[PDB]
Design a protein around this nucleic acid. Structure first.
Lengths: 269, 454, 69, 162, 459, 62
RNA sequence: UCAAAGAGUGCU
């Protein structure tokens, strides 16, 4: 269905010629590169780099159209299909590459970053959708889940949703101390802003993390026991003592980071 | 001086990759593509032949069938793979047609099974229910275990029996509510949670042979009488509404699922009549390609197509706006068709005959049930419209219209045509002299009278 | 051409256009026609009987007929 | 009426979405059956949406025992809830009828399917194996099966290095 | 009215879609316009143009000199990939000019007047004297046609898979390659066929004869659809533009005529020619090529109704209305046997006794080729489906019509003797009763539409 | 030049209500060799459709 | 090697 994709490019090509931004020969050259890429994308041996090589191409075309808009038309935005045609295409390139190659966490990353950058053009709901699928394909990668929890606590400052992410993550991957480490950091990120807000409130007029800390050891200890043990329980008593020791030493060292984490927080007791 | 010459970039036309698809240049200038009309005709004429060699309607039969002739078929309007079938032996069967086996087999009545309908009784997922009526003067509600869902894990067998003073000859269920109607010596409205008939409907003393509830305006009911009459009822008033007395008896009815006010009737004059509820003085359409009495008729859930079963050992399936059958299904082993019904996905036809076999037929003989590629669907989609464009071409008509019809039906038709010509010459001869003849519309000859004039 | 698929075979047939003994087949047939024409001529006129005998002798001189026939 | 499919692997749990529902009328005809064998046709039926690898060897055996007894593990309860919509009732295909009641208890909003139509899809998911994962890291199933085999087998016997 | 409007709107959407594809077309044709008005397109020499074009284009331009069996008639495959040249004394070689690989060579020492590919490069026919010979891809002869005798002209219809031959016998042989059977034999009754041509638009053959009348011929039809004489002298060659609208001819009396096939009207007549044209060719772009003795002169924008578009040799005081030759080229000490445009290529072929050479001409070839019809880049595997799918879509000979659009319109013992008497007396009774009906039918029309005699009218 | 009876429609095909309507469609080509890929999907598209394996539940109250 | 013809594999 190579022609189907090329045909959707015809209306904007006509708009470019109609507005005078690009001449017919110049517009013809653009289509030639688009046609060559589309065959590369739809063929066998297509790799994620082909999406990346294409995705950069219309990005450059987008810049030139913007410059020629000011250079010829002397208009910031000409009300026609050309303005949003490329950006709609860019998202339309990304979703195929992500669907074709859900493995490449790198390609997911540009897709979110490209889209977060154009916040006005792309609603936050769609960014939530992409994270939903991205989280949904890779539940075991902590780096993803703190990423979506992050986007909603700075751009949106929704602690309820951000709580639900770190909340839901510890269920899927309770073994990773890092996600425990960040959730406690988020929990004390939250309390200080309220207390600082309370201090500001007075001027113009916590234990919850410890429970997360307490429950952190119980899960991590259990998981550290499951490993270094394999399928089967360890018959020898001395090893069973030893396996306790590594869990202990593991469960001391994790606690020692949390002692360091509190130090940065001056307001809290 | 200024010169440019046509220049090919070898990389563009021949990809550097062995795996990359070669660029597929197209130019839509009509001069590049001569003989526009001839090529489409040849593709049309080629498509029509291919349709014939691929016309493969029979798929299989349901298990081992019934012991005595099959005389009642009911589809589960909520599940695809499920039928309720009955035979005059007194046995009723509930089928898993996807596996072409029986869920369960039950000896319901001492006498003949004269009606069968599947319901969802609302007693005041894992089990399905069906209602059977017979000439032994009882109606029995049954329960069958089904394997649609595994959310549980029994009580399979008779649940309730309704005794009647007279024999029952038809049964159907109201779609929304548990109430069901039985057609005996009197048309009776029944409730599941009441053993006696809740309401007595009857225009007069004449019996009722068949009945069918509405699907869209479900409060309306139609029934057929042995006095060559069709009776309409409405439950919101709990009274009959209309009758028209017909020349011949009507054996079965089906109401159009897409038009609430439209219905078709299977008639005894080798015809099936399409009716409009509000003005029944005439018919909407007439279907006249059978040579024996039409026993059953069913509307497709698409609402655009109708299938008729007749006593002449054939199943004809007609377009709603066209008065002649587009297809015939027949077999040596099929003895008499009494029930024709549609798979409610509209892709298959379930038929029952007195040989005891319940058969699956394809609505589209040439179509195939596999999932097709995006390319594949386009070409099949191409042939249909191209055939649609060139339907009346002389060669395409000959190949498309040609069917292998059994010797007995063709002989009946050619005899049938002779009398009609023999009749037609006769009034034409009379028309030369007798002054006052009203031309009788073909849509109005078969009505005898209507009680309520309009 | 490439081997046509099953449906292609049904749609189109006999499209495969565009030691040899054709010369000898022509001789064998050409003799057969000559013998037939001689038979058509009546049984009594002397001309063919000289001729058919000449054909028997002419063929025998070669070895195509191992014996008189 | 099938929308979601639960498949279960040695490397992990895999949930599928059913884009197209195969003709349930004509399930036994050859042409639809050949589609199950054919990868191109089957990819049009379903597409992978979840894969949650097990953390390691120990957790796999614990699930291998739970699934054998038709029980829902914590890892299993994780992947379903993240995926199945709360919703009338979402329909899920599972190879085991015994596992059905367990899923229903945990999630009242899901109705389980184990009919031959579900079995047909489960067979084809299994037929293509890692091909349907579109390259998602599933290890190697044939090796992983053999390890869980000694692990699942030996557990019931209570063999020991003693 | 609304239904008619919706049908028109659907058509207007189709042309709009066709306009959309016009942007998709990859490249454009060539041009050749001077910087300075003094510079003339006819003044420019080919030696200057060959320098201008690319080295690859220089390699594409192919010139081979060989005298062994001269002269050589050149024919270009419809796709333009494979070249067939047939020597007058009898050497024919099948080869692809781009590849540089000779495909098959025949050294037969019999006078061959013309040759051509039939359906693909693989199968081609060479016209030997007094018979027609078909030669396989390998070069082996697959068959000899006894029905086709002593013909100089070989035509083939890609869509109808039919070969046409013309001879002094006057008999037109119509042979279908797929069925391997001769469709029909017809005698023109116009005498020997000096000129032969095909019109792609309607696939209607064009022939020239001594009277000069041109008779249009169809396989289905017994007698000529139209007969028109452009020139007093015999027409030595007939050319038909790619669109099929325009038709150009060369009479033996030096007089040129440009015609239009649809309206059957004569566009332009030229008698100022020094000598009768050996050959005529029309480009896919519409440019006409005329070869006269050793001079070949080309006119741009010739196929137009306007008088200023009329071709004119040189110019009369640089008059704008006068249309100068787009290019004028002369081969000294040489003669042009035939002219052939290189399909899908910006070149013109010219055949001689010295050899075969290609002349590069900006704008001569089509700018963009539709690959579904023909691809120069078709691999071997695609081509074998191309013939298969084209076989599946073979056009029957009967479908040939003057206008393609018109098609599809809407317009015992005693018992047997005693039996014979009964079927008779039945038959007369039928024949009498219709008279009574006919007579009664006459009465209704009549009804619908001396004093003494009036006194006596009653009696 | 008499026109051949073989290639003549016996009657105006449905759904067209007049003779002149039928020639207009014959002028308009359906083939992809003369129509764009997108324009084919609209001309080619059949009136009636369906999805395999699903209930075509009859019309609800409008 | 090209050159023409088969029969399987991978994959859209």
């Amino acid at each position: 269905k190579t022609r189907y994709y090329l045909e959707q490019c015809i209306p904007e090509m006509d708009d470019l010629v109609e507005k005078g931004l690009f001449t017919k020969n110049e517009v013809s050259l653009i289509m030639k590169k688009r046609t060559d890429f589309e065959h590369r994308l739809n063929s066998r041996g297509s790799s994620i780099n082909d999406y990346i090589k294409y995705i950069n191409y219309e990005s450059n075309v987008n810049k030139l159209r913007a410059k020629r808009c000011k250079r010829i038309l002397q208009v910031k935005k000409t009300n026609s299909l050309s303005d949003w045609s490329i950006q709609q295409r860019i998202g339309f390139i990304y979703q195929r590459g992500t669907n074709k190659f859900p493995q490449d966490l790198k390609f997911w990353a540009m897709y979110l970053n490209y889209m977060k950058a154009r916040g006005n053009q792309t609603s936050y709901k769609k960014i939530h959708n992409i994270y939903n699928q991205l989280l949904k394909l890779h539940p075991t990668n902590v780096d993803i889940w703190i990423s979506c929890a992050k986007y909603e606590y700075e751009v949106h400052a929704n602690f309820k949703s951000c709580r639900n992410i770190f909340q839901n993550g510890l269920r899927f991957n309770p073994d990773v101390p890092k996600l425990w480490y960040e959730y406690v950091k988020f929990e004390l990120n939250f309390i200080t802003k309220l207390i600082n807000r309370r201090k500001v409130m007075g001027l113009i007029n916590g234990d919850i993390a410890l429970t997360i800390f307490d429950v952190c050891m119980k899960t991590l200890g259990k998981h550290y026991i499951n490993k270094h043990k394999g399928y089967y329980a360890i018959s020898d008593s001395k090893m069973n003592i030893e396996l306790n020791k590594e869990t202990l030493n593991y469960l001391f060292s994790e606690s020692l980071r949390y002692i360091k984490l509190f130090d940065e927080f001056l307001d809290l007791e | 001086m200024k010169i440019k010459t046509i220049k090919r970039s070898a990389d563009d036309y021949v990809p550097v990759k062995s795996t990359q698809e070669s660029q597929m240049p197209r130019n839509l200038n009509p001069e590049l593509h001569p003989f526009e009309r001839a090529r489409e005709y040849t593709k049309a004429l080629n498509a029509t032949k291919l349709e014939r060699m691929f016309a493969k309607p029979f798929v299989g039969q349901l298990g081992y069938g019934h012991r005595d002739g099959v005389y009642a078929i009911a589809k589960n309007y909520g599940s695809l793979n499920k039928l309720a079938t009955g035979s005059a032996d007194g046995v009723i069967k509930y089928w898993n047609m996807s596996t072409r086996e029986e869920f369960v087999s039950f000896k319901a009545h001492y006498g003949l099974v004269t009606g069968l309908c599947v319901t969802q009784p609302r007693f005041h997922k894992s089990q399905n229910f069906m209602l059977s009526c017979s000439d032994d003067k009882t109606v029995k509600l049954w329960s069958i275990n089904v394997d649609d869902y595994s959310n549980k894990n029994n009580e399979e067998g008779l649940i309730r029996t309704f005794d009647g003073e007279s024999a029952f000859q038809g049964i159907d269920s109201h779609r929304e509510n548990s109430t069901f109607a039985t057609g005996g010596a009197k048309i009776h409205l029944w409730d599941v949670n009441r053993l006696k008939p809740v309401s007595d409907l009857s225009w007069g003393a004449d019996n009722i042979t068949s009945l069918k509830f509405n699907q869209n305006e479900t409060d309306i009911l139609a029934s057929t009488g042995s006095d060559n009459s069709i009776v309409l009822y409405d439950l919101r008033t709990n009274s009959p509404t209309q009758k028209i007395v017909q020349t011949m008896r009507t054996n079965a009815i089906c109401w159009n699922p897409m038009e609430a006010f439209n219905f078709v009737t299977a008639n005894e004059d080798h015809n099936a009549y399409y009716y409009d509820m509000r003005n029944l003085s005439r018919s909407l359409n007439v279907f006249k390609d059978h040579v024996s009495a039409v026993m059953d008729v069913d509307f497709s859930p698409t609402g655009d197509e109708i299938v008729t079963g007749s006593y002449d050992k054939s199943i004809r399936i007609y377009k709603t706006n066209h008065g002649h059958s587009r297809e015939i299904y027949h077999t040596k082993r099929m003895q008499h068709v009494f029930q024709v019904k549609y798979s409610m996905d509209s892709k298959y036809i379930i038929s029952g005959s007195d040989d005891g076999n319940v058969r699956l037929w394809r609505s589209k003989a040439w179509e195939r049930s596999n999932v097709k590629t995006t390319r594949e669907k386009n070409k099949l989609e191409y042939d249909e419209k191209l055939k649609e464009r060139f339907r009346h071409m002389p060669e395409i008509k000959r190949i498309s219209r040609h069917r292998h019809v059994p010797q007995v039906i063709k002989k009946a038709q050619e005899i049938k045509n002779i009398e009609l010509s023999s009749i037609k010459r006769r009034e034409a001869n009379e028309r030369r002299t007798r002054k006052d003849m009203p031309y009788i519309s073909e849509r109005k000859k078969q009505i005898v009278g209507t009680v309520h004039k309009y | 051409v490439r081997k046509l698929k099953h449906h292609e075979q049904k749609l189109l047939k006999k499209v495969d256009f565009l030691e040899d003994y054709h010369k000898y087949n022509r001789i064998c047939g050409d003799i057969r026609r000559l013998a037939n024409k001689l038979s058509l001529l009546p049984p009594t006129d002397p001309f063919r009987r000289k001729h058919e005998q000449l054909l028997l002798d002419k063929l025998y001189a070669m070895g195509v007929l191992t014996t008189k026939s | 009426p099938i929308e979601y499919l639960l498949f279960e692997e040695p490397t992990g749990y895999a949930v599928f979405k059913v884009k197209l529902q195969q003709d349930d009328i004509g399930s036994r005809l050859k042409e639809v059956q050949e589609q199950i064998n054919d990868f191109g046709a089957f990819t049009k039926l379903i597409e992978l949406v979840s894969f949650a690898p097990f953390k390691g060897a120990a957790e796999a055996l614990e699930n291998a025992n739970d699934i054998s007894e038709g029980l829902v593990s914590e890892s299993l309860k994780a992947i379903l809830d993240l995926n199945l919509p709360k919703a009338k009732n979402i329909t899920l295909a599972i190879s085991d009828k015994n596992l059905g009641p367990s899923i229903k208890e945990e999630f009242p909003y899901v109705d389980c399917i184990s009919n031959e139509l579900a079995q047909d899809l489960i067979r084809g998911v299994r037929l293509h194996g890692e091909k349907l994962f579109k390259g998602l890291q599933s290890g190697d199933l044939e090796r992983a099966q053999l390890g869980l085999g000694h692990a699942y087998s030996r557990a019931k016997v209570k063999f020991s290095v003693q | 009215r609304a239904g008619l409007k919706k049908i028109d709107e659907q058509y207007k959407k189709a042309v709009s879609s066709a306009a959309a594809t016009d942007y998709l077309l990859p490249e454009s044709n060539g041009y050749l316009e001077p910087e300075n008005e003094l510079e003339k397109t006819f003044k420019v020499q080919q030696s200057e143009i060959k320098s201008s074009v690319d080295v690859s284009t220089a390699n594409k331009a192919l010139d081979l000199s060989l005298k062994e069996f001269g002269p050589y008639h050149i024919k270009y495959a419809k796709n333009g990939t494979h070249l067939l040249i047939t020597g007058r004394k009898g050497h024919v070689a099948s080869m692809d000019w781009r590849k540089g690989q000779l495909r098959a060579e025949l050294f037969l020492n019999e006078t061959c007047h013309s040759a051509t590919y039939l359906q693909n490069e693989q199968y081609f026919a060479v016209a030997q004297k007094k018979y027609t010979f078909i030669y396989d891809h390998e070069g082996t002869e697959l068959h000899r046609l006894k029905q086709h005798i002593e013909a100089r002209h070989l035509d083939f219809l890609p869509y109808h898979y039919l070969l046409v031959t013309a001879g002094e016998t006057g008999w037109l042989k119509y042979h279908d390659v797929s069925t391997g059977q001769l469709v029909s034999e017809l005698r023109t009754k116009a005498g020997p066929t000096m000129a032969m041509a095909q019109n792609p638009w309607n696939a209607v053959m064009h022939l020239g004869h001594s009277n000069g009348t041109v008779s249009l011929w169809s396989p289905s039809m017994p007698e000529p659809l139209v007969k028109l004489l452009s020139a007093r002298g015999p027409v030595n060659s007939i050319a038909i533009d790619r669109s099929g609208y325009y038709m150009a001819t060369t009479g033996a009396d030096r007089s040129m005529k440009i015609w239009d096939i649809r309206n059957f009207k004569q566009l332009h007549s030229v008698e100022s020619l020094p000598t009768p044209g050996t050959n005529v060719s029309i480009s896919d772009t519409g440019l006409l090529a005329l070869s006269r003795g050793p001079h070949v002169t080309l006119w741009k924008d010739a196929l137009k109704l306007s008088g200023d578009s009329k071709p004119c040799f040189g110019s009369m005081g640089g008059n704008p209305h006068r249309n100068t030759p787009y290019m004028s080229h002369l081969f000294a000490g040489n003669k042009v046997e035939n002219l052939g445009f290189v399909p899908f290529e910006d070149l013109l072929g010219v055949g001689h006794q010295t050899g075969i050479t290609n002349l590069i001409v900006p704008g001569a070839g089509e700018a963009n080729y539709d690959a579904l019809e023909l691809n120069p880049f078709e691999t071997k595997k695609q081509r074998q489906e191309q013939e298969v799918r084209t076989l599946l879509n073979k056009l029957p000979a009967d479908t040939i019509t003057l206008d393609p659009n018109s098609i599809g319109s809407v317009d015992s013992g005693l018992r047997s003797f005693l039996r014979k008497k009964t079927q008779n007396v039945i038959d007369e009774r039928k024949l009498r009763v219709q008279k009574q009906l006919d007579k009664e039918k006459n009465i209704r029309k009549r009804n619908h539409q001396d004093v003494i005699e009036e006194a006596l009218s009653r009696f | 030049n008499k026109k051949n009876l073989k290639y003549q429609s016996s009657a105006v095909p449905f759904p067209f209500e007049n003779r002149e309507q039928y020639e207009r469609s014959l002028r308009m080509p359906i083939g992809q060799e003369w129509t764009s890929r997108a324009s084919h999907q609209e001309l080619i598209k059949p009136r009636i459709m369906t999805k395999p394996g699903q209930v075509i539940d009859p019309l609800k109250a409008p």
